[PDB]
Amino acid sequence: ATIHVDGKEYEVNGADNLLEACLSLGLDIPYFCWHPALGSVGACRQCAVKQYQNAEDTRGRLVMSCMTPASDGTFISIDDEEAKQFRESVVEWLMTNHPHDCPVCEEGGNCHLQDMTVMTGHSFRRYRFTKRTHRNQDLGPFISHEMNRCIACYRCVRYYKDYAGGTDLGVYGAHDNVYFGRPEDGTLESEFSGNLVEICPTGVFTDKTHSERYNRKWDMQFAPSICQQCSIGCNISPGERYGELRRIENRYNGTVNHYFLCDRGRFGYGYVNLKDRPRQPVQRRGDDFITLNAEQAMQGAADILRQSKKVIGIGSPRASVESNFALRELVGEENFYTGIAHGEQERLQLALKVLREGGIYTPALREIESYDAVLVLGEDVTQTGARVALAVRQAVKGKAREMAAAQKVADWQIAAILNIGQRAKHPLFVTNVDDTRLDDIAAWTYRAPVEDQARLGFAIAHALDNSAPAVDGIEPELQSKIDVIVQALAGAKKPLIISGTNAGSLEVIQAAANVAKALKGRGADVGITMIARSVNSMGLGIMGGGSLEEALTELETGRADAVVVLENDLHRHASATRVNAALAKAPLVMVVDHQRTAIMENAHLVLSAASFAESDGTVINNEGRAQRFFQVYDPAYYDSKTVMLESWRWLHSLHSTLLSREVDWTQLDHVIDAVVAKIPELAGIKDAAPDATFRIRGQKLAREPHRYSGRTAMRANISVHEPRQPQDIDTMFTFSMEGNNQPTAHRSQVPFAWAPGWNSPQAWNKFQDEVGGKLRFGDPGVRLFETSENGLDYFTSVPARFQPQDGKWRIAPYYHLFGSDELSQRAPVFQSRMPQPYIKLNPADAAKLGVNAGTRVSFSYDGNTVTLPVEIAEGLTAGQVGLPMGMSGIAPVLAGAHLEDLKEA
Amino acid sequence: EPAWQTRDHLDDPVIGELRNRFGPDAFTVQATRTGVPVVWIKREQLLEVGDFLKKLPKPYVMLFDLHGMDERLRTHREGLPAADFSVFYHLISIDRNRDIMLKVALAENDLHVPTFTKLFPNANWYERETWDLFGITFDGHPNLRRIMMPQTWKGHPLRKDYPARATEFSPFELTKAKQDLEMEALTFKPEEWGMKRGTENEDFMFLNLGPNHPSAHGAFRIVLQLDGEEIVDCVPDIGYHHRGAEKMGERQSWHSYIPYTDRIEYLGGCVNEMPYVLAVEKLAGITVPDRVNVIRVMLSELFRINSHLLYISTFIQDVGAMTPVFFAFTDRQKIYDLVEAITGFRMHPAWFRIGGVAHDLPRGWDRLLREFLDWMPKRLASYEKAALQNTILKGRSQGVAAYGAKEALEWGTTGAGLRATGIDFDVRKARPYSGYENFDFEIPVGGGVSDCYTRVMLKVEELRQSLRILEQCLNNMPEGPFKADHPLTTPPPKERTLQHIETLITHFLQVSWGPVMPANESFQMIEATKGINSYYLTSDGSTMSYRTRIRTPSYAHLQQIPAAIRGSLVSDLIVYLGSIDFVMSDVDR
Amino acid sequence: VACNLCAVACPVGCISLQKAETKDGRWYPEFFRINFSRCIFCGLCEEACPTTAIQLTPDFEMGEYKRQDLVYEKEDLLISGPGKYPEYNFYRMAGMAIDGKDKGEAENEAKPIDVKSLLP
Amino acid sequence: DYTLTREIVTDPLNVFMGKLNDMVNWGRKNSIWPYNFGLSCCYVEMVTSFTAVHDVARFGAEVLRASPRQADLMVVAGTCFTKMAPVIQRLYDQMLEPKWVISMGACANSGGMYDIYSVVQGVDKFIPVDVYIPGCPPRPEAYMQALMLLQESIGKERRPLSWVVGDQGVYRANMQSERERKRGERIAVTNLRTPDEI
Ligand SMILES: CCCCCCCCCCCCCCCCCC(=O)OC[C@H](COP(=O)(O)OCCN)OC(=O)CCCCCCCCCCCCCCCCC
Ligand SMILES: C/C=C(/C)[C@H](O)[C@H](C)/C=C(C)\C=C/C/C(C)=C\Cc1[nH]c(OC)c(OC)c(=O)c1C
Ligand code: SF4
Ligand code: SF4
Ligand code: SF4
Ligand code: SF4
Ligand code: SF4
Ligand code: SF4
Numbered sequence A: 001a002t003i004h005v006d007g008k009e010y011e012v013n014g015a016d017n018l019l020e021a022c023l024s025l026g027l028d029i030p031y032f033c034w035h036p037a038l039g040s041v042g043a044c045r046q047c048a049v050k051q052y053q054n055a056e057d058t059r060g061r062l063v064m065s066c067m068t069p070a071s072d073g074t075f076i077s078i079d080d081e082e083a084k085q086f087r088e089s090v091v092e093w094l095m096t097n098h099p100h101d102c103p104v105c106e107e108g109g110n111c112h113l114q115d116m117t118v119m120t121g122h123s124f125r126r127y128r129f130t131k132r133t134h135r136n137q138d139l140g141p142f143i144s145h146e147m148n149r150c151i152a153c154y155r156c157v158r159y160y161k162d163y164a165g166g167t168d169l170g171v172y173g174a175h176d177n178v179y180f181g182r183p184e185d186g187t188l189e190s191e192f193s194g195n196l197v198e199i200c201p202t203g204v205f206t207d208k209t210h211s212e213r214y215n216r217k218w219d220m221q222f223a224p225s226i227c228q229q230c231s232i233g234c235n236i237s238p239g240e241r242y243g244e245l246r247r248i249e250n251r252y253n254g255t256v257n258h259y260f261l262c263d264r265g266r267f268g269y270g271y272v273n274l275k276d277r278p279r280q281p282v283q284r285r286g287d288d289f290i291t292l293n294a295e296q297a298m299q300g301a302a303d304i305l306r307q308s309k310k311v312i313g314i315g316s317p318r319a320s321v322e323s324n325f326a327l328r329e330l331v332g333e334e335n336f337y338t339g340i341a342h343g344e345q346e347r348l349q350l351a352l353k354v355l356r357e358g359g360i361y362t363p364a365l366r367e368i369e370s371y372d373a374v375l376v377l378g379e380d381v382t383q384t385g386a387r388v389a390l391a392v393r394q395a396v397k398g399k400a401r402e403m404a405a406a407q408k409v410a411d412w413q414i415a416a417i418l419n420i421g422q423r424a425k426h427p428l429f430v431t432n433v434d435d436t437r438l439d440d441i442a443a444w445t446y447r448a449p450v451e452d453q454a455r456l457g458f459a460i461a462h463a464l465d466n467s468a469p470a471v472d473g474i475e476p477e478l479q480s481k482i483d484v485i486v487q488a489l490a491g492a493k494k495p496l497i498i499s500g501t502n503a504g505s506l507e508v509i510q511a512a513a514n515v516a517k518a519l520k521g522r523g524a525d526v527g528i529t530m531i532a533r534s535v536n537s538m539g540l541g542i543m544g545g546g547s548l549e550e551a552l553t554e555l556e557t558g559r560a561d562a563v564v565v566l567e568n569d570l571h572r573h574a575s576a577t578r579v580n581a582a583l584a585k586a587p588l589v590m591v592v593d594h595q596r597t598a599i600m601e602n603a604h605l606v607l608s609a610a611s612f613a614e615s616d617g618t619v620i621n622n623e624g625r626a627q628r629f630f631q632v633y634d635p636a637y638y639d640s641k642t643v644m645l646e647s648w649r650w651l652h653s654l655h656s657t658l659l660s661r662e663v664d665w666t667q668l669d670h671v672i673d674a675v676v677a678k679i680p681e682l683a684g685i686k687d688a689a690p691d692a693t694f695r696i697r698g699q700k701l702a703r704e705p706h707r708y709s710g711r712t713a714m715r716a717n718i719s720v721h722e723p724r725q726p727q728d729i730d731t732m733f734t735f736s737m738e739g740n741n742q743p744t745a746h747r748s749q750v751p752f753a754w755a756p757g758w759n760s761p762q763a764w765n766k767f768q769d770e771v772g773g774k775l776r777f778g779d780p781g782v783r784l785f786e787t788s789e790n791g792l793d794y795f796t797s798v799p800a801r802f803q804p805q806d807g808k809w810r811i812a813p814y815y816h817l818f819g820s821d822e823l824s825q826r827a828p829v830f831q832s833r834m835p836q837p838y839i840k841l842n843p844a845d846a847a848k849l850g851v852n853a854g855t856r857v858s859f860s861y862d863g864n865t866v867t868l869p870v871e872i873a874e875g876l877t878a879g880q881v882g883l884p885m886g887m888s889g890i891a892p893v894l895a896g897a898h899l900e901d902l903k904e905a
Numbered sequence B: 001e002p003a004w005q006t007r008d009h010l011d012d013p014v015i016g017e018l019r020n021r022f023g024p025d026a027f028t029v030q031a032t033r034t035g036v037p038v039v040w041i042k043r044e045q046l047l048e049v050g051d052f053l054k055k056l057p058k059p060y061v062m063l064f065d066l067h068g069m070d071e072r073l074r075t076h077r078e079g080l081p082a083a084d085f086s087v088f089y090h091l092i093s094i095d096r097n098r099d100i101m102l103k104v105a106l107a108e109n110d111l112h113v114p115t116f117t118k119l120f121p122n123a124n125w126y127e128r129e130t131w132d133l134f135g136i137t138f139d140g141h142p143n144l145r146r147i148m149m150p151q152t153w154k155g156h157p158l159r160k161d162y163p164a165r166a167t168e169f170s171p172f173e174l175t176k177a178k179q180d181l182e183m184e185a186l187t188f189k190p191e192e193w194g195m196k197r198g199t200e201n202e203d204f205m206f207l208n209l210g211p212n213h214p215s216a217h218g219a220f221r222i223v224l225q226l227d228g229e230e231i232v233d234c235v236p237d238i239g240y241h242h243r244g245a246e247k248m249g250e251r252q253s254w255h256s257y258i259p260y261t262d263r264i265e266y267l268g269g270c271v272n273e274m275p276y277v278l279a280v281e282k283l284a285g286i287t288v289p290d291r292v293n294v295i296r297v298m299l300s301e302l303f304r305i306n307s308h309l310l311y312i313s314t315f316i317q318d319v320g321a322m323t324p325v326f327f328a329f330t331d332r333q334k335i336y337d338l339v340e341a342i343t344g345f346r347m348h349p350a351w352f353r354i355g356g357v358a359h360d361l362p363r364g365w366d367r368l369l370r371e372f373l374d375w376m377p378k379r380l381a382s383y384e385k386a387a388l389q390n391t392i393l394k395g396r397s398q399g400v401a402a403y404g405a406k407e408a409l410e411w412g413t414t415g416a417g418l419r420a421t422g423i424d425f426d427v428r429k430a431r432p433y434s435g436y437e438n439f440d441f442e443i444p445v446g447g448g449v450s451d452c453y454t455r456v457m458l459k460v461e462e463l464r465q466s467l468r469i470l471e472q473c474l475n476n477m478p479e480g481p482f483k484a485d486h487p488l489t490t491p492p493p494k495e496r497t498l499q500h501i502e503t504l505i506t507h508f509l510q511v512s513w514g515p516v517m518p519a520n521e522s523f524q525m526i527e528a529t530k531g532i533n534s535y536y537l538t539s540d541g542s543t544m545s546y547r548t549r550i551r552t553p554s555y556a557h558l559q560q561i562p563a564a565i566r567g568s569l570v571s572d573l574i575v576y577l578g579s580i581d582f583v584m585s586d587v588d589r
Numbered sequence C: 001v002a003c004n005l006c007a008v009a010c011p012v013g014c015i016s017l018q019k020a021e022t023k024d025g026r027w028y029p030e031f032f033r034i035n036f037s038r039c040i041f042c043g044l045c046e047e048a049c050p051t052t053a054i055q056l057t058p059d060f061e062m063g064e065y066k067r068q069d070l071v072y073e074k075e076d077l078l079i080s081g082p083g084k085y086p087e088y089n090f091y092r093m094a095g096m097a098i099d100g101k102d103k104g105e106a107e108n109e110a111k112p113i114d115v116k117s118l119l120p
Numbered sequence D: 001d002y003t004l005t006r007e008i009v010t011d012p013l014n015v016f017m018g019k020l021n022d023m024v025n026w027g028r029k030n031s032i033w034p035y036n037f038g039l040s041c042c043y044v045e046m047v048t049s050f051t052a053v054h055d056v057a058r059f060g061a062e063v064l065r066a067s068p069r070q071a072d073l074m075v076v077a078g079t080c081f082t083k084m085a086p087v088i089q090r091l092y093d094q095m096l097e098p099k100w101v102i103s104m105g106a107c108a109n110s111g112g113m114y115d116i117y118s119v120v121q122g123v124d125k126f127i128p129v130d131v132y133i134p135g136c137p138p139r140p141e142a143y144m145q146a147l148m149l150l151q152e153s154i155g156k157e158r159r160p161l162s163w164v165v166g167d168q169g170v171y172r173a174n175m176q177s178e179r180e181r182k183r184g185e186r187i188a189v190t191n192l193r194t195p196d197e198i
């Protein structure tokens, strides 16, 4: 298509609306109600441009550029006097009832309404009458509500209902008394409610966690990091001030996590600001805990390691690729083991074998929204990999999108799509041990034990292809349900099979692989997705290594007097008594970590590591994409005693002092080249991000905006002399504003979005080649492995039907978005959103042993009697006991494990 | 037609002459808000175009400016030739009362330009500064060494890939440079400074004037080669007052850079604030009301009287009389009382704003202005009678370091040094600005020879004319706003900020991020207290300045210093330094 | 109200503060330090203050012995009265509810109307 | 409380020797000879203080010698540039005991607004400073106030009377800071004049 804006010719996509077409060319049009991810509604009447019918016209017509298609040969004007006067009048109308709240508002400096007020050139007030006011609700611990600042642009309701699928936020009221919120007080129960602080162009919904320790956007120091709370790896912008992490913002990635995060990633960051963190290397002498510097601890650890006879290593999925590799180089390959259990490791290796050998393409997070049918096997996606569930919601709405597109309705006309697609949607079949959060849009929900889920998967695979292993003993109504599922999946053009390691069974993943292979044999465009548990589970799986149980046996025997444990507390993957015995019998226990764990009361040496806010590294997401995260700030800037170093730096310096007795704080690119040369499978992280020699026309990349304030007074309480700027030898970013953050810079990593005149999160428009699409010059992150040219065979190991037996209560895992991740539940703000750990029983089992709701019932696991209160779960099957993984005293390793000694307390 | 509109200046005759001579493909005309025709010219034809401009019927006799620019970061270069660096030449034709800009584009690797010192002898220091600050080599230059930074300075500071803030301090480097200073005074080599005849006559003694200097000009060095008392040759050594004001212009917003504009010439104050805020108003498209113009003229004339009083008193003290410096500083205290009442500060008020001034005039300023205008003229006549008519002062000052109009034009000397040659070129009358047309004042001119005494008497007459302007301003003050009605007026009026929310939004985004100037180029040239000051500003569309170029006249005067003092005495050099009216902040900056 | 505008309007960057909030909802600075060894006394902070909190008194006697003692904390800057502006109160203009000032009690603000009210 | 340079000690000051030390410090504080050092703006305000409308001569500080040997007090009245930092160091080293340093302006105090590549951030990076004055520029009466502060510091110190008999050790007085001393009256200010008046 061809457009002519203000007498200038441009080439745009013909299926885009006029607003996004003009925004992709760098032209400025004010807008409130339009969002690239939500569509167009024509509410705010702010995007007005004067459209002419042909080349030679003078009258024109004021049209909504968000509602006007960018067809071929479209003549429009933005800077016409009538259009500019109308836009200024719309801003003035929005400013009649707006409170005088900008200094005391958390959106000041980040406010879209402020930028659109300045850009339209409206600065003189003539409205002299009273301004309407509204009471403010309580929306929970994360979202702070201020309805006075609203402009009634309907972005919140559209996102929260059409996109996020939430049910407890809506628009009420009348002519000018519109109220956007819950019908009463209470917490927004949606798992993606945190995106309201960026969707809302004003200060109605604000980050209350940020609002507690509040600073302005120009005072923040940002870094482009990867979220460290689950396996999806949504790119984020941590921004700090005064040496503490202040706010996690969403960082645009057109391939993974474009405009939205989940609540766990956005608000699970309070563990960085904890006061009980290890900040120095600490060595215990008897009962005293003395503090060493870097060199003293390095020499002492080198001496004690050298006096030992054999050393073993225990990595973690919470650590980066480089840190686990540095540990592995410190101990040796043959003496290296992972920090996960044997069953967890076997499930992880099976998932990886399906991923990079099964020959079936695993899509990225954005590409999930294009599949025409979704089958989820066992994994509770909303509680573990929530953003994948959001993409599944988009893929379900794809059927209504296709039905609207059949009637020549454009993609941005979201109202017409929702009107045509009333309730018809793409098939979603979820299987879980209880009621999934996706059941509102699910075409079918299967509540059954995990063995029955795997049996269902193998039955689906046998109904798809005759060569799959059959399943005998299927009820006729369940068989009719398989007929429904196979009729949905066979007719689907892009079927999708999602499962995960959190399901806790090898046979579920095997059944998913068999269904995918049977779909592949029919020529379908089947995609397959494995969800992992932690941030770098795929990295630890790809690097391989022994399980934790071998390390525990090896330590409890006594062959090695020297163990290293990195970024682990060992209670999420092993029992507490066994870990305590293994770490008390061992005379030399080294632990490298950044959080105060339980095993530091009996560990020989503990080195204060650096978290993602203070360390660089590379992590692998569940899809298989290496992503490089950077350091946000230097802890030594605000306190010189703070020795918080990178974990791979710690281990590399210790190995250097072990061999050559020389302290070596290496660079990150040396470790990158080490993992490329040593590991051919991890060779793909070389081009995940460019090295520290990368320059945009000679200058580095700036971590903070150009209006960074308080430079000569933020440290004046300690000393009036300004210290040296912290040199970043590790990467291409500088720890100051002496750098480059231009939207047109030839780079992929972007710390923060800021254009002149665009201070809002809408400044991400200038950083993309087309708005709502990919990032300009490509998106950061590269695929480690490609699609294989053959695949795996059908797995014959069909499990038997679950048998409810007395005494042996099989534990059904009930993961949560708040309370199933280690670092997330370490945060103090999550403690109010975190529900009480409630043990869930069937009505039949509770009647059998004599339980009503709320009574405290105790069970013994590994000789430890813990007491939890009972909630009656209807969707759970009899013979199972639902337990929340990750709570206080409960481990995620208990998924799929039977439980003994259950009577009422 | 607004006076800030983006004109192309294709109706200029000089574009027609250039197209007739070099053809219509050899150059590209760039439309700017600078008010001058900007012509992008191929590097190979630079000397030909310069000689052609010098050989016009009304030639471009003066090289006003010459400096580089790093265009690697400039995103908005629509219509501009493909460049990694650029070198601009600002040439003023006095006879046409016009000026042209020539921009030579440069690749990242081939950073060499033909020298311009053959056509214009004052191009030497500008090319040395361009080589020092940008790393651009000039082929054919006699002595291409650093002029703003010491010779052992790695990198080039005005490049975009150079860090602006202060680096780590080290006393070891201090001791190393102390050692360099100590062996420089003992093992001086008059060869790297471009001097010849290194005491070849067995009597050419070598003297160092600075770097410590017990006067208000500031710290600077002159290395004199002497035959008895005659100055055979002298090499000025400047850079001892370099604050990096342009690099700070690349680091501050349009609002917060005004205090840095104050300290360019610290005897000027509001006169220094005026061209910068006028150029930013050109960039923002702001036309200030009449009351703003009269207020800014009032403060600029007051600071001009202050600077002229300090200059006359310091010259008289350099001759040898002592009492007039005490009396003139009492008069400066009267001026400072009025300025303290108006703004709230003495030396650097920081009171002008983009689109107006900071506050309004206080209730009762006319009484203080009337008191000052009654206090001045009797004391000024007393100063003339007591010191400026003394025949010992006349013998010291008359005929010392004299030059004609050709030497003033070829060295770029402006102000009293140009008007003592009889060239009636004042910016306030030739290219008027800020409502100077509404006032009636005379422009004093000399007989045609620039003595020290002639320059001092011209500054005395300029003081009297500034008193006349202040009398006219006191008798005629318009009633109106002290800030414009433009949305880019930074800051907005305070009471509307305190009780309106749109004004609060404008204030919030203008004091925090800065005002967003649309991407253009502006240039303002005014007559400062010591000559011609000018700000050339390039905006890339951001809230900071992509390029801030500050042309100051004491640079050209200090470059003219060896041309007029050769063959004279050292006391004549002292009197000449006292009569230039320069400060080292104005030279180095 | 600890709105951080004076710290960013400062070209020297010699103002450092941090916003804290009481239980009623009002905003105050947790601390407020001005490095007077760095300050150039340009008055941009007073011009940028939307509450007229920070002001510049006619007082010049600030010479010190130690440069560290030129760092004036919040207890060294907070005076007893209103200074040069004797009647302006920002929270009477602001729309946020604080102690002694409910919604609709600000200047030119109507009383809040609930959506459940019986009026059409 | 006192400071030694040749540490934190007590007041060491017999009653006749103390009386002669008091007269020596009185004669030293009542005659201070500053060095004529012209760097920047703050020097112009210093010579404003020296003139007749201000008359710093009343304190016996109108000498303003051009040689470092004759002058006692070094007033760093301007920015410390990277080229002039060895010059300032050499001029300070060419002085004679007793020597006092007064840093006029935010430039000499901390570098001021010029956090730039070619500016030393304060003269206290490489020379000791007796009295700092804030202001850009400090007014001439602020320079006189710092002069009386220097006189008060001189009148309390105990320099060695002779180089042949006595403790050859510099005894500077740890004076109470002006901020804590004037906090009793600066906070008590309630109402100031409105800026609309003159
Ligand atoms: C214990 C009591 C003692 C106290 C002191 C009392 C006596 C003070 C005597 C001071 C003597 C100062 C002598 C200065 C001589 C200067 C001669 C000279 O050459 O001056 C230069 C000036 C111009 O020279 P020319 O060559 O013409 O210049 C052309 C080139 N441009 O040439 C000229 O301007 C020409 C005129 C030169 C000066 C003529 C004589 C003046 C004498 C001083 C004034 C005395 C007033 C009465 C004092 C009290 C008496 C009781
Ligand atoms: C008893 C023995 C002694 C040494 C006495 O203490 C005094 C000091 C002797 C004399 C002779 C008095 C005064 C002359 C003088 C040393 C300076 C005046 C001055 N003052 C300035 O400022 C006010 C200047 O402007 C920069 C100056 O140029 C000049 C020249
Ligand atoms: S609360 Fe925010 S997102 Fe919702 S309509 Fe109002 S301004 Fe728009
Ligand atoms: S939402 Fe925006 S316009 Fe409204 S008070 Fe907050 S910063 Fe000001
Ligand atoms: S889905 Fe996972 S990676 Fe993404 S924001 Fe949530 S916790 Fe972080
Ligand atoms: S007066 Fe001082 S503290 Fe205020 S903005 Fe200016 S330099 Fe900063
Ligand atoms: S003093 Fe004024 S400008 Fe500074 S934070 Fe407080 S209210 Fe804002
Ligand atoms: S502190 Fe200010 S007035 Fe003093 S020298 Fe520095 S810039 Fe000039």
Ligand code: FES
Residues within 6 Å of the ligand: A030, A031, A032, A033, A034, A041, A042, A043, A044, A045, A046, A047, A048, A064, A065, A066, A067
């Ligand atoms: S953006 Fe088009 S009307 Fe809202």
Ligand SMILES: [Ca+2]
Residues within 6 Å of the ligand: A614, A615, A616, A631, A728, A730, A731
């Ligand atoms: Ca780092």
